[PDB]
């Protein structure tokens, strides 16, 4: 199938988990960066260009929850949410521990758009990239359809 040309950031505390998700993005020619913890994810996001972030909630230095809240707060300060083109907010897909509603609300209340349970399913990882990425690359693309 056709994948959108978006920039992705995957944030996990294990290099083996980073190589698995990175292999899928590399196979489909998706530009991406790697982050070790939440503080790196915030710093990498400040560099701009990101469209979709797959971030684990539990991270060594700064948790993915606080990193997501820190990104959403920085977006509001810069007016994110013609004189200057409207920069769309970055999509954040949380990597949760289980499929419980508590793990889901903790991600939604922290500013994440979606959620994926660990271990990350590569087929589910693909569907999240097309559902969210194609809405940022195409106009009026209804992924809920």
């Amino acid at each position: 199938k056709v994948f959108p040309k978006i920039n992705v950031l995957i944030v996990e505390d294990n290099v083996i988990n980073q190589a698995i998700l990175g292999s899928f993005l590399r196979k489909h020619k998706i530009s991406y960066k790697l982050a070790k913890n939440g503080q790196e994810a915030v710093n990498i996001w400040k560099e701009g260009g990101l469209h979709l972030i797959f971030m684990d909630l539990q991270l060594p230095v700064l948790s993915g929850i606080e990193a997501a809240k820190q990104i959403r707060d920085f977006e509001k300060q810069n007016g994110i949410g013609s004189k200057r083109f409207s920069q769309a907010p970055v999509i954040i897909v949380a990597l949760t521990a289980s499929n419980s509603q508590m793990d889901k609300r903790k991600a939604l209340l922290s500013g994440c758009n979606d959620y994926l349970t660990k271990p990350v399913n590569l087929h589910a990882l693909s569907k999240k990239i097309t559902e969210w990425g194609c809405m940022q690359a195409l106009i009026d693309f209804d992924s809920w359809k």
Partner: protein, 152 residues
């Protein structure tokens, strides 16, 4: 309960499905995991015989669980979760080896030999579970060696 199979091929086959372009990519991850599990086991053993920090044993079990689960190594990730909860004082019993090796669907596998304070009870369970991790780690290496047709 601990899974009956050593390898969850549903998770691992989609990783092997990416070996078409990057040849021997999944084998590289397995080799990279063996080095990570041996290092993680040594760091767990270093804390049991040395300075005891249940929060670190909690984090060491969490670290190896995320990689072993993503590679389909269910039983290794299951014991890592047990060590994870034992360090958090959430569990108070870890079954013996003979009880855990009886859960294997195919029983032709086990044809070899298996080698005070407020935290003393849990450290024994973690030391007992870390040794169970060594058996599950060896069984996974034997199972993955047969698939890849290479020694480990």
């Amino acid at each position: 309960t601990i899974p009956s199979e050593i390898i969850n091929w549903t998770i691992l086959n989609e990783i092997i499905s990416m070996d078409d372009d990057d040849s021997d990519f999944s084998k590289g991850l397995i080799i990279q995991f063996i080095d990570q599990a041996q290092t993680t086991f040594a760091q767990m053993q270093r804390q049991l015989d040395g300075e005891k920090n249940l929060t670190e044993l909690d984090n060491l079990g969490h670290f190896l669980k995320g990689s072993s689960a993503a590679l389909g190594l269910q039983r290794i990730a299951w014991v890592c979760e047990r060590i994870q909860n034992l360090g958090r004082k959430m569990e108070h019993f870890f079954p013996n080896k003979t009880e855990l090796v009886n859960t294997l669907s195919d029983k032709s596998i086990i044809n070899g030999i298996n080698i005070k304070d407020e935290n003393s009870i849990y450290l024994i369970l973690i030391a007992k579970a870390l040794n169970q991790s060594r058996l599950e780690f060896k069984l996974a290496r034997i199972e993955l060696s047969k698939y890849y047709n290479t020694n480990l």
